[PDB]
Design an enzyme around this catalytic site. Sequence first.
Site, PDB file in Angstrom:
ATOM      1  CG  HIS A  73      16.841 -18.563  -5.344  1.00  0.00           C
ATOM      2  ND1 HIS A  73      17.223 -17.241  -5.154  1.00  0.00           N
ATOM      3  CD2 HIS A  73      15.479 -18.542  -5.487  1.00  0.00           C
ATOM      4  CE1 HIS A  73      16.104 -16.489  -5.189  1.00  0.00           C
ATOM      5  NE2 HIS A  73      15.019 -17.235  -5.391  1.00  0.00           N
ATOM      6  CG  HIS A 225      11.505 -15.105  -8.968  1.00  0.00           C
ATOM      7  ND1 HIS A 225      12.803 -14.779  -9.327  1.00  0.00           N
ATOM      8  CD2 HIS A 225      11.599 -15.762  -7.769  1.00  0.00           C
ATOM      9  CE1 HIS A 225      13.616 -15.242  -8.361  1.00  0.00           C
ATOM     10  NE2 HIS A 225      12.931 -15.855  -7.391  1.00  0.00           N
ATOM     11  CG  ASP A 229      11.118 -18.720  -5.959  1.00  0.00           C
ATOM     12  OD1 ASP A 229      12.298 -18.898  -6.213  1.00  0.00           O
ATOM     13  OD2 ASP A 229      10.666 -17.679  -5.512  1.00  0.00           O
ATOM     14  CG  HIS A 252       8.293 -20.833  -1.168  1.00  0.00           C
ATOM     15  ND1 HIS A 252       9.221 -21.581  -1.879  1.00  0.00           N
ATOM     16  CD2 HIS A 252       8.529 -19.522  -1.507  1.00  0.00           C
ATOM     17  CE1 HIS A 252       9.966 -20.726  -2.600  1.00  0.00           C
ATOM     18  NE2 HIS A 252       9.586 -19.461  -2.408  1.00  0.00           N
TER      19      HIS A 252
HETATM   20  C1  C90 Z   1       8.970 -14.682  -4.917  1.00  0.00           C
HETATM   21  C2  C90 Z   1       8.809 -15.174  -3.475  1.00  0.00           C
HETATM   22  O1  C90 Z   1       8.244 -16.477  -3.474  1.00  0.00           O
HETATM   23  C3  C90 Z   1      10.176 -15.211  -2.791  1.00  0.00           C
HETATM   24  N1  C90 Z   1      10.686 -13.823  -2.610  1.00  0.00           N
HETATM   25  C4  C90 Z   1      10.707 -13.293  -1.416  1.00  0.00           C
HETATM   26  O2  C90 Z   1      10.316 -13.918  -0.450  1.00  0.00           O
HETATM   27  C5  C90 Z   1      11.174 -11.990  -1.230  1.00  0.00           C
HETATM   28  C6  C90 Z   1      11.049 -11.043  -2.251  1.00  0.00           C
HETATM   29  C7  C90 Z   1      11.500  -9.734  -2.045  1.00  0.00           C
HETATM   30  C8  C90 Z   1      12.081  -9.375  -0.819  1.00  0.00           C
HETATM   31  C9  C90 Z   1      12.527  -8.035  -0.600  1.00  0.00           C
HETATM   32  C10 C90 Z   1      12.896  -6.877  -0.415  1.00  0.00           C
HETATM   33  C11 C90 Z   1      13.313  -5.525  -0.207  1.00  0.00           C
HETATM   34  C12 C90 Z   1      13.628  -4.720  -1.306  1.00  0.00           C
HETATM   35  C13 C90 Z   1      14.025  -3.392  -1.110  1.00  0.00           C
HETATM   36  C14 C90 Z   1      14.104  -2.866   0.185  1.00  0.00           C
HETATM   37  C15 C90 Z   1      14.530  -1.428   0.392  1.00  0.00           C
HETATM   38  N2  C90 Z   1      13.376  -0.544   0.408  1.00  0.00           N
HETATM   39  C16 C90 Z   1      12.524  -0.827   1.547  1.00  0.00           C
HETATM   40  C17 C90 Z   1      11.403   0.211   1.603  1.00  0.00           C
HETATM   41  O3  C90 Z   1      11.478   1.084   0.459  1.00  0.00           O
HETATM   42  C18 C90 Z   1      11.462   0.357  -0.784  1.00  0.00           C
HETATM   43  C19 C90 Z   1      12.602  -0.665  -0.813  1.00  0.00           C
HETATM   44  C20 C90 Z   1      13.789  -3.673   1.286  1.00  0.00           C
HETATM   45  C21 C90 Z   1      13.393  -5.003   1.088  1.00  0.00           C
HETATM   46  C22 C90 Z   1      12.205 -10.327   0.198  1.00  0.00           C
HETATM   47  C23 C90 Z   1      11.749 -11.630  -0.008  1.00  0.00           C
HETATM   48  C24 C90 Z   1      11.162 -15.995  -3.654  1.00  0.00           C
HETATM   49  O4  C90 Z   1      11.610 -15.514  -4.673  1.00  0.00           O
HETATM   50  N3  C90 Z   1      11.508 -17.189  -3.257  1.00  0.00           N
HETATM   51  O5  C90 Z   1      12.364 -17.894  -3.974  1.00  0.00           O
HETATM   52 ZN    ZN Z   2      12.990 -16.930  -5.616  1.00  0.00          ZN
END
Ligand code: C90
Ligand code: ZN
Length: 268
Positions: A73, A225, A229, A252
């Site tokens: 980020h 997104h 990333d 990644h």
């Molecule tokens: C794009 C990728 O490559 C990378 N993203 C990630 O790895 C990444 C994305 C999302 C999350 C998350 C989350 C999350 C949201 C809400 C809840 C709460 N509740 C739980 C059960 O009921 C519904 C919601 C718990 C957890 C974690 C990690 C990135 O953006 N990297 O830069």
């Molecule tokens: Zn990201």
Amino acid sequence: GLEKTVKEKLSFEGVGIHTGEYSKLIIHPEKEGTGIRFFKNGVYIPARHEFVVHTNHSTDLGFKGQRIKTVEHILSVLHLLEITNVTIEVIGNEIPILDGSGWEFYEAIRKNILNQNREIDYFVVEEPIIVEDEGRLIKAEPSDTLEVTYEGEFKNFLGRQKFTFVEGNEEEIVLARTFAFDWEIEHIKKVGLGKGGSLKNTLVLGKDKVYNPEGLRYENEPVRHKVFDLIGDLYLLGSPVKGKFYSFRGGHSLNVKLVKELAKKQKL
Ligand SMILES: C[C@@H](O)[C@H](NC(=O)c1ccc(C#Cc2ccc(CN3CCOCC3)cc2)cc1)C(=O)NO
Ligand SMILES: [Zn+2]
């Protein structure tokens, strides 16, 4: 392009999406040719690939034992603002996810950019290269500027989607929040990750519904997104990048491998 830094020290703080713990940040300007590096426990961790220690659900850097998670980020924000000399002091184990996007970092550092007197050593793609892995594929080729495209085959109503990010279109991807699928959350948690993921810092989707009542700010926030990333991991080359790139279901892991290959076949 001249080396760019911040005219004054800036500070950022918030919980990490994976660590779910509070973390603080302090960006202090640097001298020309200093480069982009983090400062933790009295240990400077340059923003390079050789410093990558874990690539999963986020790119992480670590050295001498120190570890920083989710650096794609901040790194991506600097890639768009073309910053080359700055020291990001990190307080915690993961970079605060803030609202799940990089709009804040971009606006705060943007209102404090300082031009220096030295040309930057952009990493220009001189030859074409491609990496593959379980359907994932990323092709890089020379381009008069930086152009990163991303295509992804999703399993929910998103189906297949793709978006092209060209220099001057950051305002269209920095607002891209992070995103996860309800079926993926179960895994992100069981693996001890996303401890801070919330509907306020993550875009949770389902087989045919968007958990976040705010909906998507764009018709391709997800792939957008991924381009964000990928732009951050792309900085792992040690300098801003110039060229065109197309990613298909890339992750990644591939992002790092591609960079590693680019820096390995390009050398100095
Ligand atoms: C794009 C990728 O490559 C990378 N993203 C990630 O790895 C990444 C994305 C999302 C999350 C998350 C989350 C999350 C949201 C809400 C809840 C709460 N509740 C739980 C059960 O009921 C519904 C919601 C718990 C957890 C974690 C990690 C990135 O953006 N990297 O830069
Ligand atoms: Zn990201």
